[PDB]
Amino acid sequence: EFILEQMRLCLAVKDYIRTQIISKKINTKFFQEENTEKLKLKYYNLMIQLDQHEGSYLSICKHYRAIYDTPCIQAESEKWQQALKSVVLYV
């Protein structure tokens, strides 16, 4: 959480290179989300915001596919609909 916090601050300053540099320090620390889900959602949402800046179109698709996490996300279908629609829209 501490290392994820300043990423949004660096986005706010609009210095994308430093955000991308500090982003690589979390991805390798996977398989710890057995009891946390908010962290994963925010973690993926930051890259959703970042990647669609310049021209990226596959990475945003990968993230929206990654919104397939713990069933706590798909048990409220009213927004699971657009969650599964945005991916096929970006494909």
UniProtKB/Swiss-Prot annotation:
The gene is PSMD12. This is 26S proteasome non-ATPase regulatory subunit 12. It comes from the Eukaryota. Component of the 19S proteasome regulatory particle complex. The 26S proteasome consists of a 20S core particle (CP) and two 19S regulatory subunits (RP). The regulatory particle is made of a lid composed of 9 subunits including PSMD12, a base containing 6 ATPases and few additional components. Interacts with ERCC6. It is linked to Stankiewicz-Isidor syndrome: A neurodevelopmental disorder characterized by delayed psychomotor development, intellectual disability, behavioral disorders, mild dysmorphism, ophthalmologic anomalies, feeding difficulties, deafness, and variable congenital malformations of the cardiac and/or urogenital systems. Component of the 26S proteasome, a multiprotein complex involved in the ATP-dependent degradation of ubiquitinated proteins. This complex plays a key role in the maintenance of protein homeostasis by removing misfolded or damaged proteins, which could impair cellular functions, and by removing proteins whose functions are no longer required. Therefore, the proteasome participates in numerous cellular processes, including cell cycle progression, apoptosis, or DNA damage repair. Belongs to the proteasome subunit p55 family. The modification N6-acetyllysine is found at residue 38. The lineage of its organism: Eukaryota, Metazoa, Chordata, Craniata, Vertebrata.
